[PDB]
Amino acid sequence: ELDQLRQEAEQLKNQIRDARKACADATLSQITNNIDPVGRIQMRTRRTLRGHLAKIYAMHWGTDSRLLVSASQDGKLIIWDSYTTNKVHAIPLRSSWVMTCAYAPSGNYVACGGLDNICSIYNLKTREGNVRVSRELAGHTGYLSCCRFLDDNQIVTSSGDTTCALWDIETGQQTTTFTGHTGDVMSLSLAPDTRLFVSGACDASAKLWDVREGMCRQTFTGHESDINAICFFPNGNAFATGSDDATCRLFDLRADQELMTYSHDNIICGITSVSFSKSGRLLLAGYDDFNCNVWDALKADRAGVLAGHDNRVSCLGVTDDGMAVATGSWDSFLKIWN
Amino acid sequence: VQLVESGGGLVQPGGSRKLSCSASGFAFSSFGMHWVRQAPEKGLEWVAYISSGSGTIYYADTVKGRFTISRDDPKNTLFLQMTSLRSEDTAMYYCVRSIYYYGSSPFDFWGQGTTLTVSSSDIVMTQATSSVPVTPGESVSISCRSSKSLLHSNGNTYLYWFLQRPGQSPQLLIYRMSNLASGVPDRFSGSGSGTAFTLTISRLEAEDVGVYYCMQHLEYPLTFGAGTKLEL
Amino acid sequence: CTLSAEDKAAVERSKMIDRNLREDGEKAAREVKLLLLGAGESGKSTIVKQMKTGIVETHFTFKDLHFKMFDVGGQRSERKKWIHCFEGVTAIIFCVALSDYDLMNRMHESMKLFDSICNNKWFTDTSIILFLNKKDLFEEKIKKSPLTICYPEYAGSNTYEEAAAYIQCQFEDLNKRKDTKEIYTHFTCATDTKNVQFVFDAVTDVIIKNNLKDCGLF
Amino acid sequence: PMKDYMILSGPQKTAVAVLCTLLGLLSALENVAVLYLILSSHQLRRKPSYLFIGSLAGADFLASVVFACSFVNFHVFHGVDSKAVFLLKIGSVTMTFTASVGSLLLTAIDRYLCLRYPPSYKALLTRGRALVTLGIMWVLSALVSYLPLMGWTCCPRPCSELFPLIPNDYLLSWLLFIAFLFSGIIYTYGHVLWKAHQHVASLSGHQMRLDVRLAKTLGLVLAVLLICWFPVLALMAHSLATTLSDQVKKAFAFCSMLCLINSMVNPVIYALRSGEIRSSAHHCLAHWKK
Amino acid sequence: ASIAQARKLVEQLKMEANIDRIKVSKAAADLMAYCEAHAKEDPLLTPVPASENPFRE
Ligand SMILES: CC(C)(CCCCCC#N)c1cc(O)c2c(c1)OC(C)(C)[C@@H]1CC[C@@H](CO)C[C@@H]21
């Protein structure tokens, strides 16, 4: 009888909830009640990266904090020089229907995937002055929603088949497959030491995976709808999700609970993209209402507004030196906000 | 990737001759291509440059007006139409590819060259040493001093280091100042101070023997130094 | 000009990349994108053969106009997480079998996929091209089994010319967006060979009515 | 001694001073309301069709503040009216009305490439190519209209009968340019109404709305281009073969009211018929409520 | 069939329940300590001058 195993699994996640309430002695908003607020944050559009012709679906900064790759649905993958607004590369994709892109931390590779279920790694720093597909990673049976490089040889991808996967790039096979989700995994975020990663799915749950062990360490259930965005705190001991029920929630990894909820009554639409700044004091969330809200992460209070996109802000990321924020949108424009 | 040049040969002075640089093994149309000549005892000297898409076309002041550089992208071929040849045009003309974006490595591949024989405001790069006796395993510091600050406002120091081994084409070592080129060993290292620059070979092997040219890429014309020969 | 010799050559590369983005965007703006959205393989692949893995793009040409049918039946994911990718498609070619009315019900599953994607948020203005195929098999079934199995509120007889006009009107009464989108209905089969002619006529009615909407005339 | 045209007395000059005041400012009211609503919306300022609506609403705005001022400064004010600055003033009403007539042709041609080449239309007429042909239209409508003060006096001709101080032989080269602009508009609006007849008959042949939906809109367009402009151009061309009568002396200045009557329908007929202008009109009624 | 699938959920929830958790007041103070220790190195929190900023419009 599996209903006995159903009765034990309902008894066992009460021990999850009771041992999580046994640590909730003081909230984050009680501790940072006696701290000074951030005030008002005035961010200006420094650059507008024009040149895409469709909805920009992802971007990713390089670790040098100057180059960024972006993916749009015109079948292009442009690498931008963000300081002097030059296109470094324009990579034509075999599938126009891309939903993610990643820049390698070495700078030599760019991956992208989408509705074709394939994460194609493109080699930028070749000979020949050309950008060629160095690998295509097949094995996912759903649309590939996110990809992040661990190094030049490993890449974690997530997909709509309720499955994240770790890949070896040269032997293009799944080294590890992360199952346990019951909905389409919409995002992932590696830890700063890249030994763990969190993944948010459409079953309103985030899961913390061990990369080398291959197991689900912790499961975080606090949302009511599809988690579209996830991002690690710069400490690596917390993360912030962003979902379709218009709230961002800050979960920690050690106390195993959520700390804050970043919600307003003026926002009704969901979050597409979540990223902390450097030092984790700011939480920049992009929304469906053409708008990116800067949240003071230690309090709940809203700091300034990154307004200036004519369509839904689909992607955003802060540079690794924390100097700028680039937001892409469904109008074909990437704006850089210092 | 290889560049092979055609043309050359004995030409009467005042005549005309067309050099052709057949490119193969690389995306030729996305590269700017240079012509760099070397007189049979002197050092390198930049002649002409045509960009990708033939947008900008530059020449040296010695060859302006009577030389014409042109590319043909479907055949992957680079031309240098030379008319009214003088006795100062007796040289080995190298055909150099160079791509320009952020973080690129210009001047990275050099062609083999065709010896053309005829019958009988510029930044000054100065390498005061002309010949250095070296034993292998030692530490060498080739020095090059400019006549202008090669450091730009964007932070880049446009100083290029080449190594022409005896009997070969030049090979890029250090593309911007302190930027090791791809495929060269880690024992080379560049360093500079805006106007004075050094190239440090840590533990020199037998392959490091040759002439070392410093080139500026701050403005056109690109000028080389009369390089420092290294001898065992 | 305050740019170096290499940064001026990096701007010229970026301008030449810009020139190839417009030449490749003009080549794609002259193309017609179509989203094929049949319900449970209801003749969805039998009209792909009549023109001329995640999604299957089918390129074909008719009267110097390049079409692209993006069949999305091989996804099996949550549709709402990727159906906004096809927002901006020219039309939605919908395939409903006319012989699944007797086969919870197979035809009511077609009307539910029709109702969700025609009254969608992202397809509030993209016209549906409904394809009521397998009409030859509908002849051999409506003479024996009436339409009272799928549609109990149906008083007309078992003549095909009034039964097919009822299934067309039952599907075309599902758009609440009648002021902004239109539904082009065809009755096809495998033996019908004028179906790419209908798609060329139905999407040139879409592109004309979209150009007149964008030029301020409508 | 130019004073030979003001045959307006009593209720005639009353019907020009007060009428053109309310005709002028109200037509200039909505013209700047359209010119604001185009540049306020950045999604509309990138569309190459509302530039031709903007250059209509631009040229019609200048033709409703210059001609409405120069008609009231001529008939009741009786200014100094010099021999050289008059041809600046009769040319600044002729450019700004031809550039509103030629901006109907650039709107008609733009409405013809919607039906002649449907799928390549947004690829053909781009924002770059829109401002180019707007520049050629603005400077062709200048040199055909400012050619009076750029070296054309009425002394080598005998000279005109209806217009003060203009050559009669120029009036046969401007009328036949607007007629070419008018036979370029009607012939364009004939094939828009013909490619909407070889398409609705073709689509309905598989299993008549667009044909009527254009003919009711492009008929009301061509009504106010012929109810307004043809009672200005017909008697203007009548002065050649036969001399003028006495009862038509004052009526031509009263038939000249129809040109700025055409100015207060052109935001209604070209911009208010558009939905994307009107969708930003309802959007901006909460914008300045503060 | 689902006898092992319900066993796989019990075996997953058992290794998730027996982890050790710190108090939330300790995890919130260690987040508050990170945002104050690195506050001077944050170019969006504390706006940098236009010289050190590499974006000059
Ligand atoms: C708008 C247009 C139809 C343009 C036609 C002109 C074409 C070239 C010529 N020729 C027009 C019609 C006019 O009847 C007049 C106009 C402009 O402007 C002013 C300067 C006010 C005239 C002053 C003298 C009045 C007669 O005593 C007539 C007034």
Search tags:
heteropentamer, C: 218 residues, alpha/beta, Rossmann fold, 5 helices, 6 strands, elongated, D: 290 residues, mainly alpha, 16 helices, binds the ligand CC(C)(CCCCCC#N)c1cc(O)c2c(c1)OC(C)(C)[C@@H]1CC[C@@H](CO)C[C@@H]21, membrane protein, GPCR, Gi Protein, pentameric
How would you characterize this protein structure?
It is classed as membrane protein. Keywords: GPCR, Gi Protein, membrane protein. It forms a pentameric assembly. The entry is titled "Cryo-EM structure of a class A GPCR with G protein complex". Chain A is Guanine nucleotide-binding protein G(I)/G(S)/G(T) subunit beta-1. The complex is a heteropentamer of chains A (338), B (232), C (218), D (290) and E (57). Chain A has 338 residues and is mainly beta. Chain A is 7% helix and 48% strand. In chain A, strand 2 and strand 3 form a beta hairpin. Chain C has a single domain (3-218), classed as P-loop containing nucleotide triphosphate hydrolases (Rossmann fold). A 6-stranded mixed sheet of chain C has the order 2-3-1-4-5-6, sandwiched between helices. The radius of gyration of chain C is 21 Å and the shape is elongated. In chain D, helix 1 packs antiparallel against helix 4 (67-75) and helix 5 (86-110) packs antiparallel against helix 7. Chain D contains 16 helices and no strands. Chain D is mainly α. The radius of gyration of chain D is 21 Å and the shape is globular. Chain D has one domain (1-290): Rhodopsin 7-helix transmembrane proteins (Rhopdopsin 7-helix transmembrane proteins), CATH 1.20.1070.10. Chain E has 57 residues and is an all-alpha fold. The N and C termini of chain E lie far apart (62 Å). Chain A binds chain C through residues 51-55, 57, 73-76, 78, 81, 84-90, 92, 95, 97, 99, 114-118, 141-143, 145, 160-161, 183-184, 186, 202, 226, and chain C through 7, 10-11, 13-14, 17-18, 20-21, 24-25, 28, 53-55, 70, 72, 75-78, 81-82, 85, 87-88. The structure holds the ligand CC(C)(CCCCCC#N)c1cc(O)c2c(c1)OC(C)(C)[C@@H]1CC[C@@H](CO)C[C@@H]21. Ligand E3R binds next to helix 4, helix 5 and helix 8 of chain D.
Strand % of chain E is under 5%
Overall shape of chain C: it is: elongated
Please identify the top-level CATH class of chain C: Alpha Beta
Specify which chain pair forms the largest interface: A-E, 64 and 43 residues
Total beta strands of chain E: 0
Pfam families (chain A): WD40_Gbeta
Family (chain A): Belongs to the WD repeat G protein beta family.
GO molecular function (chain A): GTPase activity; GTPase binding; protein-containing complex binding; signaling receptor complex adaptor activity
Keywords (chain A): Acetylation, Disease variant, Host-virus interaction, Intellectual disability, Phosphoprotein, Repeat, Transducer, WD repeat
